Write a protein that binds this ligand. Sequence first.
Ligand SMILES: [Zn+2]
Ligand SMILES: [Zn+2]
Ligand SMILES: [Zn+2]
Length: 124
Amino acid sequence: TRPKCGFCHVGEEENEARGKLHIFNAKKAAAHYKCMLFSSGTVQLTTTSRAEFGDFDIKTVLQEIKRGKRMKCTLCSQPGATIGCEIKACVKTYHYHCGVQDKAKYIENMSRGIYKLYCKNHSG
Ligand SMILES: [Zn+2]
Ligand SMILES: [Zn+2]
Ligand SMILES: [Zn+2]
């Protein structure tokens, strides 16, 4: 009944770790803030933070949820793993929490609007 993230398949019980669950339509398409923020195809439109949610192109987020159905996580093997390593040919791709667990590096630059993941092989 209650909504769950279209990426990681969990609802509001993981809001603190994965970011607030946002709901996008009456079919309960939804995503935690970090799950959508780092999704490779999510288009950000204005400055964002956890304190002040920015503007995003929600159509791109819904497209990413759809793509996610095809994307098995590098760590857990379940679908919805749309946070791909930034290095173009790298196959590693994650759910947000799985990337943390598998020692990926998350890069954030709030002023430039840069949010990306580098896997453990591309961490430098
Ligand atoms: Zn999520
Ligand atoms: Zn996973
Ligand atoms: Zn990589």
